[PDB]
């Protein structure tokens, strides 16, 4: 299937073990496709001071178009010194790993796979 309904836990940025998928740009979008995937992949909400706390590459969910069955419809934005590797909307947040943090919230998404 091109899109899969995915529930990401929502994570407390001081909560995160593992704080990225990586050390390249191509790496990091791999490994955030493959934590999807296999239902261990968190998302933390960004505002004032969450990305200093995470490392870079960044991966970002953006949505993607304006919901079915509650899902929005996202896709996969890279970010590392200030450029993105990818054109899409709103950020919904930053994809971490799970490795058994306890969720503040669960996001509904759509993820073009």
């Known amino acids: 299937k091109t899109h899969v309904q995915l529930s990401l836990p929502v994570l407390q940025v001081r909560d995160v073990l593992v704080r990225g998928f990586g050390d390249s740009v191509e790496e990091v979008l791999s490994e955030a496709r493959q934590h999807l995937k296999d239902g261990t992949?968190?998302?933390?909400?960004?505002?004032?001071?969450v990305?200093?706390?995470?490392?870079?590459?960044?991966?970002?969910?953006?949505?993607?178009?304006?919901?079915?069955?509650?899902?929005v419809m996202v896709e996969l934005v890279a970010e590392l010194e200030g450029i993105q590797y990818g054109r899409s909307?709103?950020?919904?947040?930053?994809?971490?790993?799970?490795?058994?943090?306890?969720?503040?919230?669960?996001?509904?998404?759509?993820l073009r796979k």
Do not use: M, N, W
């Open 41 to 49: 992949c968190g998302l933390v909400e960004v505002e004032k001071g």
């Open 51 to 71: 990305l200093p706390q995470l490392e870079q590459p960044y991966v970002f969910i953006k949505r993607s178009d304006a919901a079915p069955h509650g899902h």
């Open 89 to 110: 909307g709103e950020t919904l947040g930053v994809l971490v790993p799970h490795v058994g943090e306890i969720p503040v919230a669960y996001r509904k998404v759509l």
